Design a protein around this nucleic acid. Sequence first.
DNA 1: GGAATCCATTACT
DNA 2: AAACGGAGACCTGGTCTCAATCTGCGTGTT
DNA 3: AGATTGAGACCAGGTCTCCGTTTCATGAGTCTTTCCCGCACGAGCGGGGGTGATCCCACGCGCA
DNA 4: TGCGCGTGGGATCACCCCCGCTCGTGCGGGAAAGACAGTAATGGATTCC
Lengths: 281, 288, 278, 292, 93, 93
Amino acid sequence: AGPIIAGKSESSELPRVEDRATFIYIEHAKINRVDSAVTVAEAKGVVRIPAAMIGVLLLGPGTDISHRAVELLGDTGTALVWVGEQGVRYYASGRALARSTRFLVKQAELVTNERSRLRVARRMYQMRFPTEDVSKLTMQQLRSHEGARVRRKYRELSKKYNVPWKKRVYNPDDFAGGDPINQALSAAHVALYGLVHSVVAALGLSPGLGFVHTGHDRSFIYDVADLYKAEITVPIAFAVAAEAEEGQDIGQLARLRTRDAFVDGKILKRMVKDLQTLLEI
Amino acid sequence: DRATFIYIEHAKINRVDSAVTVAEAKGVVRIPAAMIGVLLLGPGTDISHRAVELLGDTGTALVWVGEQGVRYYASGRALARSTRFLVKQAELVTNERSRLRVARRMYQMRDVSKLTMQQLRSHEGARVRRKYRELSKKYNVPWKKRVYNPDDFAGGDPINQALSAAHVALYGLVHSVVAALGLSPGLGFVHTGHDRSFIYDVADLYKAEITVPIAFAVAAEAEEGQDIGQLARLRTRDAFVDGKILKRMVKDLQTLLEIPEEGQIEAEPLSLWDDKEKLVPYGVNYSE
Amino acid sequence: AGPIIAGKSESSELPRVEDRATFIYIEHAKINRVDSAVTVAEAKGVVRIPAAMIGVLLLGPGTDISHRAVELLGDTGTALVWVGEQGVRYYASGRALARSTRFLVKQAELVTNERSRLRVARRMYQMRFPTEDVSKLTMQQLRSHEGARVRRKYRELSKKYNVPWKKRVYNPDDFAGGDPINQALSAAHVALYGLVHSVVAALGLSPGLGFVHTGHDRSFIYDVADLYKAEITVPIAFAVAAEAEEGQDIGQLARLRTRDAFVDGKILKRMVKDLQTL
Amino acid sequence: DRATFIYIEHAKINRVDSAVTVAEAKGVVRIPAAMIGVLLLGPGTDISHRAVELLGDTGTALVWVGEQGVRYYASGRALARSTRFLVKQAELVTNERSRLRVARRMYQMRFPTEDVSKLTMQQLRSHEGARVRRKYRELSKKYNVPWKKRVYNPDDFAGGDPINQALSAAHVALYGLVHSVVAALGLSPGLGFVHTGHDRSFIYDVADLYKAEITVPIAFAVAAEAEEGQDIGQLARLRTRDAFVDGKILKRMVKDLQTLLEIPEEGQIEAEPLSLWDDKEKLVPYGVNYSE
Amino acid sequence: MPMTVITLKNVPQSLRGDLTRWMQEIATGVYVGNFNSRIREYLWRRVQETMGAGEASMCFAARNELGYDFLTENASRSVIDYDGLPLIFIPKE
Amino acid sequence: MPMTVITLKNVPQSLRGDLTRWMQEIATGVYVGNFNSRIREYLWRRVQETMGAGEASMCFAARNELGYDFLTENASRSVIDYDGLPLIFIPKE
DNA sequence: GGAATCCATTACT
DNA sequence: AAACGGAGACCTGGTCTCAATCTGCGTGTT
DNA sequence: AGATTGAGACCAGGTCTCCGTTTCATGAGTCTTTCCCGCACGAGCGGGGGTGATCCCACGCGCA
DNA sequence: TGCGCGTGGGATCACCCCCGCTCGTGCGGGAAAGACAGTAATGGATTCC
């Protein structure tokens, strides 16, 4: 091919969305690009994140990121998500990773048709709950029926793992993260939230096209993430809350447990394999 | 209906209580974030996570670009957490009846009511062919023909390199603009099959008016012995400094999407070190 | 464990016998030990041999090997064979890699008993030709069977590849020949001869306790090599000579293809199982 | 039926026309290959391929040993490529009746004056433990070295009694040559009679015929003549290797191995431990050339 | 996925950081990662032209006994085969 | 079948030639080879005890999505676990 | 017969 | 406000060469 | 003689700083179809490896 | 000092762990032609120098 220069590479030279790691949490560091390399710099020293195999590069509190750093990360295709306490805060992404918009245009056909929207919206449920029939359940009931089911799973947890539950379904907009239980689930939740945004920009899908959540440009993310919302991360993170000790940071070990759940559950393989089925390709 | 497009380069942004704090070499700027929608973050800028904390609350969109959009690098959320613009784009692209209407509207922006998609496409090639012929004699330059190697830019004609360098600047600007507005570059009307399909469709509006004369101008004064992609980039940089192009483009997208005039949003540039007198009455503290 | 010293290691540190490479072919160079490293100093430079992953090493004409190098190689379990022209010249082995002698003591019991030697020879032959039934057959007419079949295998393969013959059967003793087929047979064969010598010493099995052959201290390796030479080394030995052109190093081409034959045939894993059942 | 256990160290060897040459610092010599029975290759020696091919056809046993055979490193084929001793060993070890015979035979050299040919293995090993206590005690009082009990640790060589460290080093020093002759004669080191289950099992049984006569007297002597803070492992090897210089002990193993294997006296070969500069006058009349 | 390792010396500092996006830097001029066949070829292709005047050698899983093979260009140590076996050759200075 | 690379700096020359019996030398102080779990663990003990005062690090395949993990002893380039990932850390003076 | 011109003659965007 | 290329400049750390040294790494009835 | 150690010279590569120069590596007037390249899952799925148990003298020693 | 075994101690016969699972498929990726409604350059039909 043509000349290859530092920081620039074709999508062929870069690993596919499946062969990459999940995420990295960052806190109190400056992200600067030196010698054409992303370098997260802390007080003690510098660490070179291997961007090529990063799903999403989570960004925490008290951190600074330069301009060429975002450009270098965008070229790699790793998503950038700003998170702190009380829930997720901001999203970012590069241009793309796949040059074919076939996935996007197929999604465009599906969203516009009301008949097509109802077909796919019901099909969320049997991927969430394969033992129930939603063949004759309307769009309005979908919001209410799934709204009760997500609450039921949490209620089952409270009596199961023997730890108090605040009865607060995760709403990322100005969420209540006071009690250590809440940050554990939220930090677990933002891990997939960054992951879901990471793959969607990689495959060319647009987060604006909503299925069950509507009104915001992150509607598609809030729906795909809802597919695996309670199946994988919720039992693992809540079980972490049961195995809680004092004198250590809950977030770091909880994030580690979500990592093991993600690799054990093959979330990256399952999620895109679904989207291929979800688009009838 | 008020949209603020602010370009920041060679500076640093932090937060104190509720406003972003630009720390450029001239001084400290205290723009409130309650009325900010776009941060055209230029080269060599530093953003603080605390600053990003507020911008999410107001629906402000972040875009990372080069010299005021000469190239597009990355973006974020949309204006005021609004996805209606993209929704109409999806509606306008599925059925070919809507697709043909906007495609015909795109051509007349550059008779259209009877030309079909292939019929429209041939004319655009004809008109663009005449435009190259006209400027070649107008600028008295020896343009043989548009011959280009996509994977070999160094080996090529200076005029061909000039157009290639000039064009790629334009797509970056529109991509930065369209990403902020909340649309999707994949959903193209005439162009289709690429992640920037919508980009090359919209950018065709201003290729003849802006970039092509710039590419021919730099080629006319081009001297053998130096690169011209840098020269073409700067000749686009100053042309993009004014920001009247962005004002035209945001209106064109609303017209292209048949946005009602009442619902149409007007966007204007804000140069912090050049529009000080305008920003002071809105509650901005300036320091040196 | 105790202290660790450079140049010395336990059996556990060394890899398993069948998990290593087969052989290397070294000529016109001096083998020395510098900085606790087996090194081959050729005319233009030096190379370092990963002795842990090496089964048997070979030495051709015009080479020199130092006393310290021998013991360093012997510690790793890699045996030494002086691969001169006209076939094998001499052997060399170090301490047995295997700590126990349960394999060795069982071999002694089987080899010394005439009926057990008969039974083992029955097992040895049927691996070569499983189709035939050798329930009632003794030592004297065995040697007729293998010798004829090897000749028959040699003849039919020669015509299949159209190579001239001198009607000779290959033995590593008192061999000779200027025709390219002569050294092509030797070079391919000797790698098998070296490989079996290394592994048999690694397992702790003495080479003098042969069954088909008897009369020398390397009888056992000859008998084991007889089991696999017809199956493996002979087809390539004829194949490489026919494929080779004039003015070319037949041995380099010959040894290269035999290494592939050792890989795909799973010879190392197979024979250790074969020695297990013998 | 004479085998030459000639020792080579600090020299280069090659081939000129038909006889092996030696390139030691003192001079260059041209010993014929026919005379060579066994080359005890010591430290600081290199071997040329042309020498080996001239040595392979004549059946010479090339053994790589330590300084004067203090240690064993590696070896090639047996002398004259024969294996009659090894096959004899296998026959005499497979059956208990010969195992009874040879096991009592070894104790006969252990107790030349006392007949224990009727004592079973349990009594033989029992009375074997009796003599070792006396020999340690008797030599302890002779050299005024305080002796308590055989105490050591294979995983901890440094943390040992100076008497024990010398004793352990002395046995390993003798283990060298006694394994070298076994490999030179082609015997299987694995097939041991008293000791069984280790690749050196045959070596320990043969070496025990000389441990009470060489190693223990040397080890006790070294322990007395040793100052604090000085490592004795090299001292024990150096003191032992002095006894190997003459080679008189070397003939003893050669004769003994035939005696243990019940080889007929005519078939009992006897080795001659030659040395280059020790027997210059002896080699020259046969046809050896000595050049400065 | 099979492992891969890259070595570098006397190379412009632009590349020394660029490859760190793919493979981390355990030591000076040493990079390690787990890549398939397609990805590794393109990265080696990247180092093919931007190495400048220096050394670059790479190792990866192969289909021989040792299970790895070497590729070198403009290298102090050439790679020589002994009957199909990759062994490092250090030329005499 | 797993792969393992070992890097060294400022170590006695006795050990530098020692792993040449297990590894090969693609570059100075850089050794690479293929082991199982048992052989690699045992050898890492050897380079741990004999290196004395020096630099020693190694890369080996692991059970994480990165596909490998890091073990370091007396290493300037330490390793920091970002919730289950091995990343090379370089202290700054 | 061939040049100049037109439309086929052939072919570029 | 970053961030990279070129020109030192200084350093450790690897490598070669020349005396001095040892022949080598230790279990086998307590 | 060969190999190791140590002391000492020696010098190339790495790294740091300082100064200067950039804000960059450069397509599509047009999409569609079709020949090369794919690598994870589907079908019945038993050859390996980690290791408890234990022998019989090694460490040590008690009565005799 | 006579006499053996109280703790081992790791290979090894063989026990239960593992995926068993590797070629074809078919699912996406290419890349190169190949269309699609237009001029430009140029040569035969027509007529004139």
